[PDB]
Design a protein around this ligand. Structure first.
Ligand SMILES: [Ca+2]
Ligand code: NA
Length: 139
Protein backbone atom coordinates (compact mmCIF):
# COMPACT_ATOMS: atom_id res chain seq x y z
CA UNK A 1 0.00 0.00 0.00
CA UNK A 2 1.25 3.44 -0.96
CA UNK A 3 2.23 5.90 1.74
CA UNK A 4 2.14 9.69 1.62
CA UNK A 5 5.24 11.81 0.97
CA UNK A 6 5.04 15.60 1.21
CA UNK A 7 7.08 18.68 2.03
CA UNK A 8 8.09 18.41 5.66
CA UNK A 9 7.61 22.05 6.58
CA UNK A 10 3.85 22.15 6.02
CA UNK A 11 1.69 22.15 9.13
CA UNK A 12 -1.52 20.13 9.27
CA UNK A 13 -4.11 22.86 9.97
CA UNK A 14 -7.29 20.76 9.48
CA UNK A 15 -8.02 17.13 8.66
CA UNK A 16 -5.85 13.99 8.99
CA UNK A 17 -3.26 12.84 6.46
CA UNK A 18 -4.88 9.39 6.37
CA UNK A 19 -7.75 11.17 4.62
CA UNK A 20 -5.50 11.44 1.57
CA UNK A 21 -5.45 7.67 1.04
CA UNK A 22 -8.95 6.58 2.16
CA UNK A 23 -10.47 6.38 -1.35
CA UNK A 24 -12.98 9.13 -0.61
CA UNK A 25 -12.84 12.39 -2.58
CA UNK A 26 -14.90 14.04 0.15
CA UNK A 27 -12.26 13.77 2.89
CA UNK A 28 -9.11 15.89 2.75
CA UNK A 29 -6.42 17.90 4.52
CA UNK A 30 -5.66 21.62 4.83
CA UNK A 31 -1.96 22.49 5.19
CA UNK A 32 -0.60 25.78 6.49
CA UNK A 33 2.46 26.80 4.52
CA UNK A 34 5.31 28.63 6.24
CA UNK A 35 7.59 31.21 4.55
CA UNK A 36 4.93 33.87 4.92
CA UNK A 37 1.99 31.73 3.79
CA UNK A 38 3.91 30.81 0.62
CA UNK A 39 4.36 27.46 -1.03
CA UNK A 40 7.78 27.70 -2.68
CA UNK A 41 8.61 26.12 -6.04
CA UNK A 42 9.79 22.54 -5.49
CA UNK A 43 7.40 21.68 -2.66
CA UNK A 44 5.46 18.51 -3.24
CA UNK A 45 2.98 15.85 -2.27
CA UNK A 46 2.49 12.31 -3.58
CA UNK A 47 3.14 8.66 -2.92
CA UNK A 48 5.91 6.27 -1.97
CA UNK A 49 4.76 3.05 -3.65
CA UNK A 50 7.05 0.83 -1.50
CA UNK A 51 8.56 -0.90 -4.53
CA UNK A 52 8.99 -0.23 -8.25
CA UNK A 53 5.71 -0.98 -10.01
CA UNK A 54 4.29 -0.45 -13.50
CA UNK A 55 1.69 2.34 -13.44
CA UNK A 56 -1.16 2.53 -15.93
CA UNK A 57 -2.24 5.87 -14.57
CA UNK A 58 -2.90 8.14 -11.57
CA UNK A 59 -5.85 9.91 -10.02
CA UNK A 60 -5.01 12.76 -7.64
CA UNK A 61 -7.63 15.16 -6.25
CA UNK A 62 -6.24 18.53 -5.18
CA UNK A 63 -8.26 21.11 -3.30
CA UNK A 64 -11.22 20.35 -1.03
CA UNK A 65 -14.73 21.70 -0.25
CA UNK A 66 -15.35 24.76 1.94
CA UNK A 67 -12.34 26.15 3.86
CA UNK A 68 -9.29 26.43 1.61
CA UNK A 69 -11.30 25.64 -1.55
CA UNK A 70 -9.03 27.96 -3.59
CA UNK A 71 -5.82 27.02 -1.67
CA UNK A 72 -4.15 25.33 -4.60
CA UNK A 73 -1.02 25.63 -6.67
CA UNK A 74 -1.40 27.36 -10.00
CA UNK A 75 1.60 25.76 -11.78
CA UNK A 76 2.69 22.25 -10.90
CA UNK A 77 4.00 19.10 -12.52
CA UNK A 78 3.43 15.39 -12.20
CA UNK A 79 6.76 13.54 -11.87
CA UNK A 80 8.07 10.11 -10.92
CA UNK A 81 11.20 8.48 -9.61
CA UNK A 82 12.80 5.11 -9.08
CA UNK A 83 15.09 6.20 -6.24
CA UNK A 84 13.65 9.37 -4.59
CA UNK A 85 16.65 11.32 -5.97
CA UNK A 86 16.22 11.77 -9.74
CA UNK A 87 12.83 12.76 -11.08
CA UNK A 88 11.18 12.58 -14.45
CA UNK A 89 8.22 14.70 -15.42
CA UNK A 90 5.14 13.27 -16.99
CA UNK A 91 2.96 16.42 -17.23
CA UNK A 92 3.12 20.16 -16.42
CA UNK A 93 -0.13 21.91 -15.40
CA UNK A 94 -1.32 25.51 -15.33
CA UNK A 95 -4.54 25.75 -13.29
CA UNK A 96 -4.61 29.52 -12.86
CA UNK A 97 -8.28 30.56 -12.51
CA UNK A 98 -9.52 26.97 -12.10
CA UNK A 99 -12.90 26.78 -10.28
CA UNK A 100 -12.72 26.79 -6.46
CA UNK A 101 -12.79 23.38 -4.88
CA UNK A 102 -11.78 19.85 -5.73
CA UNK A 103 -9.83 19.36 -8.99
CA UNK A 104 -9.29 15.85 -10.36
CA UNK A 105 -5.87 15.40 -11.90
CA UNK A 106 -6.16 12.10 -13.79
CA UNK A 107 -3.79 10.64 -16.35
CA UNK A 108 -3.62 7.35 -18.22
CA UNK A 109 -0.48 5.86 -19.70
CA UNK A 110 -0.86 3.65 -22.83
CA UNK A 111 2.47 2.06 -22.00
CA UNK A 112 2.98 1.64 -18.25
CA UNK A 113 5.52 3.76 -16.44
CA UNK A 114 7.72 2.00 -13.87
CA UNK A 115 7.92 4.10 -10.72
CA UNK A 116 8.61 3.73 -6.99
CA UNK A 117 7.58 7.35 -6.16
CA UNK A 118 5.10 9.61 -7.92
CA UNK A 119 4.07 13.10 -6.93
CA UNK A 120 2.82 16.59 -7.77
CA UNK A 121 5.42 19.32 -7.37
CA UNK A 122 4.92 23.07 -7.31
CA UNK A 123 6.60 24.93 -10.23
CA UNK A 124 6.10 28.55 -9.02
CA UNK A 125 5.97 30.31 -5.64
CA UNK A 126 2.40 31.03 -4.57
CA UNK A 127 1.23 33.00 -1.52
CA UNK A 128 -1.29 30.41 -0.36
CA UNK A 129 -1.91 27.55 2.05
CA UNK A 130 -2.87 24.20 0.42
CA UNK A 131 -5.70 21.66 0.45
CA UNK A 132 -5.77 18.15 -0.91
CA UNK A 133 -8.23 15.27 -0.94
CA UNK A 134 -6.89 12.06 -2.49
CA UNK A 135 -3.89 10.30 -4.05
CA UNK A 136 -4.32 7.05 -5.95
CA UNK A 137 -2.59 5.04 -8.68
CA UNK A 138 -3.90 2.60 -11.28
CA UNK A 139 -1.69 -0.50 -11.80
CA1 LIG B 1 -9.84 11.45 0.83
NA1 NA C 1 -15.45 20.82 -3.68
Amino acid sequence: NPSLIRSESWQVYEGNEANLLDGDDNTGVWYKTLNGDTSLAGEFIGLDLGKEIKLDGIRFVIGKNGGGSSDKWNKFKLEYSLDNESWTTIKEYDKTGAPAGKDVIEESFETPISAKYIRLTNMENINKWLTFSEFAIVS
